[model samples]
Target: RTLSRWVWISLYYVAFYVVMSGIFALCIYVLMRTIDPYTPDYQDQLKSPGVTLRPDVQEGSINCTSEKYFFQESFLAPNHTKFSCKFGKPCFIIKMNRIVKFLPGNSDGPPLYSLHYFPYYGKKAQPHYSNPKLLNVPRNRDVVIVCKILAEHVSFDNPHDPYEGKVEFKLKIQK
Candidate 1:
């Protein structure tokens, strides 16, 4: 006797949820139809796109080896296999996410960064700031460089690359 009543109650709840779900889906469909396809709904919420370092995904792996530079404490000490940030001067490759038409530039042919490039603010805020001081910096892997995407329309966000709009890497020299 009671079993039939429970069955009816469960069926009623199921029907109610089904109807609600349908209505919710319909609302989303309508919203999609109303929204503009060209531009995102929330423009202000967007941030600058970022660039990322290549080979960073495999950083510190055997994939990267230094043949020219080697570290040792003494004649008796075992030669350290790890590449030193100094002598190795690993050449860090810079790459940008291709979403919009983005171009990269720096003091040199490639995009690079320095200590000053960081903590970047709005253009007007840092009017005096410039792309790292490269006047006297050593060439060919003796220094660190930062490369950035130079498009006003694009912004970067990659899980693998943390920096916004730019990537940093170490340069290596054979000598």
Candidate 2:
């Protein structure tokens, strides 16, 4: 009886640990792809949110790597932020739109592709994303581009209506 009980307890512990590990890994994966950049594992996945194109789905939202790209005034361009602020608090979301098209790199060109990003456009950007496939940050592979956002902040000086560029976050991407 004693031996049987010990075996059962051991199995129970193992099962518990396995479940917990899976949850932790999932959260880390989501945060790494969508919210955290400290995760060295998912950089390329985060930075280049639109590097990949999805064919199956018409439109949807996807994840971007966490904590890599961020905000700063761009000297080169006017009225164009270096990078656009994502939707939602803590900059924890990305709203996407339907009918996104991907253009391929052509011959006689240096192989450059374009992703016509159609994220959700509202009075303010929503925290949802379009095309989850486009947001899948691949692991252990060479990444063409990487974006990592640090944190989202609310500005008091430059106040606006709800969701009208009132919130800003930091993100970085590797090319």
Candidate 3:
């Protein structure tokens, strides 16, 4: 009866909490020890595609008729926020339908629209950011181009996303 009294109960609770705290501390210590300072563990990264011609594939492609080379500054979002373009040369807003942390690139070189290798911290982090690539179509020529998402981790091959992993579009730069 004395063992089951308030004094014993209080000691038992204290002992239980103490053990738990020790386990928690041990877990944290183990986690800290296992971390490699040199390398990052960004294992959960995801990656998108497409092309179309004229007013032909207006649903999925960029259409430019009047201008010799089509370029735009920004596209107005539903909330009326203007998302500006930053193409290295002629401002072409080339991007995937949905951006799931996708960084585009291939064996040849960096992505056409390059996001830095590091995670984007904020506006302050990347004040002078610019797209590292640009499309310079020959003047007075009808050219066919393919824009593909080369990230192995991300799949854009859905029926809804008409361009999906790959897209072929035609470009005509009239002089």
Candidate 4:
């Protein structure tokens, strides 16, 4: 009787673990699908794929200029891909062009995945000093344009590998 009871208890525990594991796996798969860059709705981002998304490693950078009637010559926001020339100084804005968050490769397998979304921008419109109607940029020196990532997560999946990844952008310079 004692041995039979132990066997039943062990079987129950094993089944519980299996069920929990399956549930966890399903959740992860769903999240990945939802955030995948290849979704049809986000087809606009089909051109640009992956970015050198480093925490602060400075893989790519951009510039801005007041000489073009936008920037002020300030270089505070460095180490990003896109830069703005709004007021005086140049600022960089790096965003996730794709909808999918990456998972870094592992040792035996590939890498782990992470969901991290962050945006960066520089610019503050003061109520008393100025208004949008005036459209007058401050003469102080420069402005801080806002930069942000519209996504919700990030990870690493062969940062150097070729992927039909999810993310794209287009810049229109109108006259």
Top of the candidates by TM-score? 1
* TM-score: the better of candidates 1 and 4: 1
Residue 90 displacement (Å), model 2: 47
> Which model, 2 or 3, shows the larger lDDT?
3
TM-score-superior candidate, 3 or 4: 3
Mind giving the per-residue lDDT tens digits that candidate 2 earns over 1-175? 5856898889998999999999999898887676422113433322322221222221243334433322232223343322333221112333222221111112121111112222212212332333322243333333332222222321122343222222333222233
Q: What's the lDDT for residue 175 in model 1? A: 58
Q: Go through the candidates in order and give each one's C-alpha lDDT.
A: 0.44, 0.32, 0.42, 0.33
lDDT, candidate 4, 21-92, per-residue tens: 999998999877875232244534433334422224221222332122222233233433223222132223
Clashes of each: 18, 29, 0, 41
What C-alpha lDDT, on a 0 to 100 scale, does residue 42 get in candidate 2? 37
lDDT of 4 at 173: 21
Model 3 regions more than 4 Å off: 1-4, 41-103, 106-154, 157-175
Candidate 2 backbone overlaps, count = 29
True-structure lDDT of candidate 2: 0.32
Instruction: Give the root-mean-square deviation of each candidate in angstroms.
Output: 19.9, 20.1, 16.0, 20.6
TM-score of 1: 0.40
How big is the positional error of residue 120 in model 4, measured in Å on the Cα after superposition?
A: 5.4
Superposed model 1: Cα runs more than 4 Å off: 56-93, 98-162, 168-175
Against the true structure, what is each candidate's TM-score? 0.40, 0.21, 0.32, 0.25
